[PDB]
Amino acid sequence: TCPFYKKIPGTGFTVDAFQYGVVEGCTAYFLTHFHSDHYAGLSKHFTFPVYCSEITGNLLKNKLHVQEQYIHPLPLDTECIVNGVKVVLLDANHCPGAVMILFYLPNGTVILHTGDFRADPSMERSLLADQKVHMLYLDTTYCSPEYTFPSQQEVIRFAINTAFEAVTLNPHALVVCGTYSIGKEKVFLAIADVLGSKVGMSQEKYKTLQCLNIPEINSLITTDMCSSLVHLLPMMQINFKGLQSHLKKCGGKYNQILAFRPTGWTHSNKFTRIADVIPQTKGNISIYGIPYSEHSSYLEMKRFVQWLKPQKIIPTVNVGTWKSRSTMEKYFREWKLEAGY
Ligand code: NI
C-alpha cells in the first residue's frame, strides 16, 4: 500500500509510486527520474498514463519497454495542464532527465515535489521565483551537518588531473570507471576528453547512454573496447580481483589500471580534503574513491529551504526511524527561526 508522502492531496496524482499495484483514485502516475528505487514496478505490461521528462520517457520505452501509448513526456520550464491541473517540470540537478514537479492545486495551494535533487542557487531564478509554496516534499538524503563534500567541478578537476598525470607518465595504463545506474556521466566523459579517447563499454550500457540526449554522444562513446583507453565496468567489479581479471582480458595491451569509484558521501569526508585524497593500491592496480554527489549537501539544502520559505515540509528520505524523523524536524525548526518565516 502507497505511503502518504507519495500522494498529492486534492488530485488524482501520485509520485514515484509504481510498486503498489493499482493505486485507488490515481488517474496519472508521475515519475521524477529513472533510478530503480523510484521506478520499482514499471514494465511493458503497465497500462496507466505515466508523466515524465523526454529523457525519462526514452528510457521507459527502450530499457523497460513500456508501450508508447502510455508515455507522456513534458517539456521543462513550461506550464502544462494534466487532467485539469496546472503542472510545471523543473530541472532537479540530479541525473539526466531528473525533474522537480510544481503542482497548482484547484483550491489555490501550491506544492513542490523535489524528487531527488542537488539544490543550487540557480534554482532561485527558475519559475520558483514568481510565487509562494505551501507544501515542500523534500529530498532529505543528507539532512545532517556532518554531510559535507566538494563541488562537482572540484571533484572533476581532481579526476582529470589524476588520470592525465598517470597516463602521461605511463602510456600503457588503462583507466576504469565504475557505474551502476545513470548519473555521474561527467566523471568518465571528462577523463576520456582529456586523454583523447572514446569511452568503451558493454552494449547494455551503450544503449542506456543513447537514450540521454547528450550532444555529440556518437563522438564520445563506443562498444569497441580495444580502441578505447577509458573503460566502464559495473560498480561491483571495482575491486582488486575484478580489475585483475579485466586486465587479463585486454591481451597484453596494458600493464597498469587506475580506477575510479564515484560514491556519495563517505566518513573519510569528515577528515580529508579532495586535494589530499589517496588511492588503495595492490601492485599495478590503484582505486580512487571520489565524493561526486548528485544530492544536496546539508548547507545547499538549508540555503534552498530558507530561500523558498515553505509553510510545511514533508521529508521523502530517511523516514523509516523515529530518531531520523526527530533530527530532521529539529533542523527544519532551526532554519525557520533563524530566517524568520
Ligand atoms: Ni535518484
Coordinates of C-alpha atoms and ligand atoms in Angstrom, one line a residue:
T1 CA 0.0 0.0 0.0
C2 CA 1.1 3.5 -1.1
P3 CA 2.6 5.7 1.7
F4 CA 1.1 9.2 2.4
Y5 CA 4.2 11.2 1.3
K6 CA 3.8 9.8 -2.4
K7 CA 0.3 11.2 -2.7
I8 CA -0.7 14.7 -3.9
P9 CA -3.8 15.8 -2.0
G10 CA -6.7 17.2 -4.0
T11 CA -5.6 15.5 -7.2
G12 CA -5.7 12.1 -8.8
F13 CA -1.9 12.1 -8.8
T14 CA 1.0 10.0 -7.3
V15 CA 4.7 10.5 -7.5
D16 CA 7.2 7.6 -7.8
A17 CA 4.5 5.1 -6.8
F18 CA 4.8 2.1 -9.2
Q19 CA 5.4 -0.8 -6.7
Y20 CA 2.0 -0.8 -5.0
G21 CA -0.3 -2.2 -7.8
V22 CA -3.2 -0.1 -8.9
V23 CA -3.4 2.9 -6.6
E24 CA -7.1 3.7 -5.6
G25 CA -8.0 7.0 -7.2
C26 CA -4.9 7.5 -9.3
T27 CA -5.5 8.9 -12.8
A28 CA -1.9 9.9 -13.5
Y29 CA 1.4 8.4 -12.2
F30 CA 4.4 10.9 -12.2
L31 CA 7.9 9.6 -12.4
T32 CA 10.7 12.1 -11.3
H33 CA 13.7 10.1 -12.7
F34 CA 15.0 6.8 -13.9
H35 CA 16.5 5.4 -10.7
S36 CA 15.4 1.9 -9.6
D37 CA 14.1 2.7 -6.1
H38 CA 11.7 5.2 -7.8
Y39 CA 10.7 3.3 -11.0
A40 CA 10.3 -0.1 -9.0
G41 CA 7.2 -1.8 -10.5
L42 CA 7.0 -0.4 -14.1
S43 CA 7.2 -2.8 -17.1
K44 CA 5.8 -3.4 -20.7
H45 CA 2.5 -4.5 -19.1
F46 CA 1.8 -1.2 -17.4
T47 CA -1.4 0.4 -18.8
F48 CA -1.9 3.8 -16.8
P49 CA -0.6 7.2 -18.1
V50 CA 2.9 8.0 -17.0
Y51 CA 4.1 11.6 -16.9
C52 CA 7.8 12.4 -17.0
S53 CA 10.6 14.2 -18.9
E54 CA 11.6 13.4 -22.6
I55 CA 14.8 11.6 -21.3
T56 CA 12.9 9.6 -18.7
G57 CA 10.5 8.7 -21.5
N58 CA 13.3 7.5 -23.8
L59 CA 14.5 5.2 -21.0
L60 CA 11.0 3.8 -20.2
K61 CA 10.4 2.9 -23.8
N62 CA 13.8 1.4 -24.6
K63 CA 15.0 -0.1 -21.4
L64 CA 11.8 -1.2 -19.6
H65 CA 9.7 -1.5 -22.8
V66 CA 6.7 0.5 -21.6
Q67 CA 4.4 0.9 -24.6
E68 CA 4.5 4.3 -26.2
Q69 CA 0.7 5.0 -25.9
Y70 CA 1.2 5.2 -22.0
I71 CA 4.3 7.5 -22.1
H72 CA 3.5 11.2 -21.6
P73 CA 6.7 13.4 -22.0
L74 CA 6.5 17.1 -20.9
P75 CA 8.9 19.8 -21.7
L76 CA 10.7 21.6 -18.9
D77 CA 10.0 25.2 -17.7
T78 CA 6.6 25.2 -19.3
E79 CA 3.1 25.4 -17.8
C80 CA 1.1 22.3 -18.8
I81 CA -2.4 21.1 -18.0
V82 CA -2.7 17.5 -16.8
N83 CA -6.2 16.1 -16.0
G84 CA -7.4 19.6 -15.4
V85 CA -4.5 20.7 -13.1
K86 CA -1.6 23.1 -14.0
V87 CA 1.9 21.5 -13.5
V88 CA 5.5 22.6 -14.3
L89 CA 8.6 20.3 -14.5
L90 CA 11.9 21.8 -13.4
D91 CA 15.5 20.5 -13.8
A92 CA 16.5 18.8 -10.4
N93 CA 20.3 18.9 -11.0
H94 CA 20.3 15.1 -10.2
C95 CA 20.9 12.5 -13.0
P96 CA 19.9 13.0 -16.7
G97 CA 16.2 13.5 -17.2
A98 CA 15.5 14.1 -13.4
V99 CA 12.8 16.7 -12.5
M100 CA 11.1 18.5 -9.7
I101 CA 7.4 19.0 -10.1
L102 CA 5.3 22.1 -9.2
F103 CA 1.5 21.4 -8.8
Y104 CA -1.0 24.3 -8.8
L105 CA -4.0 22.8 -6.9
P106 CA -7.5 23.8 -7.8
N107 CA -8.1 25.2 -4.3
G108 CA -5.0 27.7 -4.6
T109 CA -2.4 25.6 -2.7
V110 CA 1.0 25.3 -4.5
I111 CA 3.1 22.1 -3.9
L112 CA 6.8 21.5 -4.9
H113 CA 8.0 17.8 -5.0
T114 CA 11.8 17.9 -5.4
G115 CA 12.2 14.2 -6.4
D116 CA 15.9 13.6 -5.9
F117 CA 17.9 16.9 -6.3
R118 CA 21.1 18.8 -5.7
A119 CA 20.0 22.2 -4.6
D120 CA 21.7 25.1 -6.4
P121 CA 21.4 28.9 -6.2
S122 CA 20.4 28.9 -10.0
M123 CA 17.1 27.4 -8.8
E124 CA 16.3 30.7 -7.1
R125 CA 15.9 32.1 -10.7
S126 CA 13.7 29.5 -12.2
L127 CA 9.8 29.7 -12.3
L128 CA 10.1 29.2 -8.5
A129 CA 10.8 32.9 -8.0
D130 CA 7.3 34.1 -9.0
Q131 CA 5.1 32.6 -6.2
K132 CA 4.6 31.1 -2.9
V133 CA 4.8 27.4 -2.0
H134 CA 2.6 26.0 0.8
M135 CA 4.0 22.3 0.9
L136 CA 7.5 21.1 0.0
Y137 CA 8.2 17.3 -0.4
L138 CA 11.9 17.4 0.2
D139 CA 14.9 15.1 -0.7
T140 CA 16.5 14.9 2.8
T141 CA 19.2 12.3 1.9
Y142 CA 21.9 14.3 3.5
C143 CA 20.0 16.3 6.1
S144 CA 22.6 16.5 8.8
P145 CA 25.6 18.9 9.2
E146 CA 28.2 16.2 9.1
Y147 CA 27.3 15.7 5.5
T148 CA 29.9 17.8 3.6
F149 CA 31.5 17.2 0.2
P150 CA 33.1 19.4 -2.6
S151 CA 31.5 20.9 -5.7
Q152 CA 31.1 18.6 -8.7
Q153 CA 33.6 21.0 -10.5
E154 CA 36.4 20.4 -7.9
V155 CA 35.8 16.7 -8.0
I156 CA 36.1 16.6 -11.8
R157 CA 39.2 18.8 -11.7
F158 CA 40.8 16.2 -9.3
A159 CA 39.9 13.3 -11.5
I160 CA 41.0 14.9 -14.9
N161 CA 44.4 15.9 -13.4
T162 CA 44.9 12.5 -11.7
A163 CA 44.1 10.5 -14.9
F164 CA 46.2 12.8 -17.2
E165 CA 49.2 12.6 -14.9
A166 CA 49.1 8.8 -14.7
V167 CA 48.7 8.1 -18.4
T168 CA 51.3 10.7 -19.4
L169 CA 53.8 9.0 -17.1
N170 CA 52.7 5.6 -18.4
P171 CA 51.1 5.4 -21.9
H172 CA 50.4 1.8 -21.2
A173 CA 48.0 2.4 -18.2
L174 CA 44.2 1.8 -18.6
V175 CA 41.6 4.0 -16.8
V176 CA 38.5 2.2 -15.5
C177 CA 35.3 4.0 -14.1
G178 CA 32.6 2.2 -12.1
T179 CA 28.8 2.6 -12.8
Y180 CA 25.5 1.0 -11.7
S181 CA 22.8 3.4 -12.7
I182 CA 22.5 6.6 -14.8
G183 CA 24.0 9.8 -13.3
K184 CA 27.6 10.9 -12.8
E185 CA 28.5 10.6 -16.5
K186 CA 30.7 13.8 -16.3
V187 CA 33.3 11.6 -14.4
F188 CA 34.1 9.3 -17.3
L189 CA 33.3 11.8 -20.1
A190 CA 35.8 14.4 -18.6
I191 CA 38.6 11.8 -18.2
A192 CA 38.1 10.4 -21.8
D193 CA 38.2 14.0 -23.2
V194 CA 41.5 14.9 -21.5
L195 CA 43.0 11.6 -22.8
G196 CA 41.7 12.0 -26.3
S197 CA 39.9 8.7 -26.2
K198 CA 36.3 7.4 -26.6
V199 CA 34.7 5.7 -23.6
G200 CA 34.4 1.9 -24.1
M201 CA 31.5 -0.1 -22.5
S202 CA 29.0 -3.0 -22.9
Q203 CA 26.2 -3.0 -25.4
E204 CA 23.7 -2.7 -22.5
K205 CA 25.4 0.5 -21.1
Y206 CA 25.8 2.0 -24.6
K207 CA 22.1 1.6 -25.1
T208 CA 21.3 3.4 -21.9
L209 CA 23.6 6.3 -22.8
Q210 CA 22.0 6.6 -26.3
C211 CA 18.6 7.5 -24.5
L212 CA 20.1 10.6 -22.7
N213 CA 20.1 13.4 -25.4
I214 CA 23.8 14.2 -24.7
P215 CA 25.2 16.4 -27.5
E216 CA 27.7 14.8 -29.9
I217 CA 27.4 11.4 -28.0
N218 CA 28.4 9.3 -31.0
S219 CA 31.7 11.2 -30.9
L220 CA 32.2 10.2 -27.2
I221 CA 31.4 6.5 -26.6
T222 CA 31.8 3.1 -28.2
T223 CA 31.3 -0.6 -27.8
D224 CA 34.7 -1.4 -29.3
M225 CA 36.7 -1.8 -26.1
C226 CA 40.1 -2.4 -27.8
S227 CA 40.0 1.0 -29.4
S228 CA 39.5 2.9 -26.1
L229 CA 41.7 3.6 -23.0
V230 CA 38.8 4.5 -20.7
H231 CA 36.6 1.6 -19.9
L232 CA 33.3 1.4 -17.9
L233 CA 32.6 -1.5 -15.7
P234 CA 29.8 -2.4 -13.3
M235 CA 30.5 -0.8 -9.8
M236 CA 30.7 -4.3 -8.3
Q237 CA 33.7 -5.2 -10.3
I238 CA 35.7 -2.2 -9.0
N239 CA 38.0 -4.1 -6.6
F240 CA 41.4 -5.8 -6.9
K241 CA 40.0 -9.2 -8.0
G242 CA 37.6 -7.8 -10.6
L243 CA 40.2 -5.4 -12.1
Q244 CA 42.9 -8.2 -12.2
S245 CA 40.5 -10.3 -14.2
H246 CA 39.7 -7.3 -16.5
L247 CA 43.4 -6.6 -17.2
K248 CA 43.9 -10.3 -18.3
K249 CA 41.3 -9.8 -21.0
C250 CA 43.0 -6.8 -22.6
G251 CA 45.6 -9.1 -24.3
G252 CA 48.8 -7.5 -23.0
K253 CA 47.9 -4.0 -24.3
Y254 CA 48.1 -2.6 -20.7
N255 CA 50.3 -3.1 -17.7
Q256 CA 48.6 -0.8 -15.1
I257 CA 45.0 0.2 -14.1
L258 CA 43.9 3.3 -12.4
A259 CA 40.2 3.1 -11.4
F260 CA 37.6 5.5 -10.0
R261 CA 34.6 4.6 -7.8
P262 CA 32.3 7.5 -7.6
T263 CA 30.5 7.2 -4.3
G264 CA 28.2 9.5 -2.4
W265 CA 29.4 10.9 1.0
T266 CA 31.7 8.5 2.9
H267 CA 33.1 9.4 6.5
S268 CA 36.6 10.0 5.1
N269 CA 34.9 13.4 4.1
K270 CA 35.0 14.3 7.8
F271 CA 38.8 14.4 7.8
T272 CA 40.3 14.6 4.2
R273 CA 40.2 17.4 1.6
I274 CA 39.6 16.4 -2.0
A275 CA 43.2 17.5 -3.0
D276 CA 44.6 15.2 -0.3
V277 CA 42.7 12.0 -1.4
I278 CA 44.9 9.0 -1.9
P279 CA 44.1 5.6 -3.5
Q280 CA 44.1 2.0 -2.3
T281 CA 46.9 0.2 -4.2
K282 CA 47.9 -3.5 -4.9
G283 CA 50.8 -4.0 -7.3
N284 CA 50.0 -2.4 -10.7
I285 CA 46.3 -1.5 -9.6
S286 CA 45.1 1.7 -7.9
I287 CA 41.5 2.5 -6.9
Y288 CA 40.3 6.1 -6.0
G289 CA 37.0 6.7 -4.1
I290 CA 35.8 10.1 -5.2
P291 CA 32.8 12.0 -3.5
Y292 CA 30.9 13.0 -6.6
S293 CA 27.3 13.7 -5.2
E294 CA 24.1 14.2 -7.1
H295 CA 22.2 15.1 -3.8
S296 CA 22.3 18.4 -1.8
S297 CA 24.9 18.8 0.9
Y298 CA 23.4 19.9 4.3
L299 CA 24.4 23.6 3.6
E300 CA 23.0 23.6 0.0
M301 CA 19.7 22.2 1.3
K302 CA 19.4 24.7 4.1
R303 CA 20.0 27.5 1.7
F304 CA 17.3 26.4 -0.7
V305 CA 14.7 25.9 2.0
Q306 CA 15.5 29.2 3.8
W307 CA 15.0 30.9 0.3
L308 CA 11.8 29.1 -0.6
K309 CA 10.1 29.6 2.9
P310 CA 7.6 26.8 2.7
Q311 CA 4.7 26.6 5.1
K312 CA 5.1 22.9 5.7
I313 CA 7.9 20.4 4.9
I314 CA 7.4 16.6 4.2
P315 CA 10.7 14.6 4.0
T316 CA 10.8 11.8 1.4
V317 CA 14.2 10.2 2.5
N318 CA 15.2 8.7 5.9
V319 CA 11.6 8.5 7.0
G320 CA 11.8 5.0 8.5
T321 CA 13.2 5.7 12.0
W322 CA 11.9 7.9 14.9
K323 CA 15.5 9.2 15.5
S324 CA 15.8 10.3 11.8
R325 CA 12.4 12.0 11.8
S326 CA 13.1 13.8 15.0
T327 CA 16.6 15.0 13.9
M328 CA 15.1 16.3 10.6
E329 CA 12.2 18.2 12.4
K330 CA 14.7 19.9 14.7
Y331 CA 16.7 21.2 11.8
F332 CA 13.6 22.5 9.9
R333 CA 12.6 24.5 13.1
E334 CA 16.1 25.9 13.5
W335 CA 16.1 27.0 9.8
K336 CA 12.7 28.7 10.2
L337 CA 13.6 30.6 13.4
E338 CA 17.0 31.7 12.0
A339 CA 15.4 33.1 8.8
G340 CA 12.1 34.4 10.4
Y341 CA 9.4 32.7 8.3
Ligands
NI1 NI 18.0 9.2 -7.5

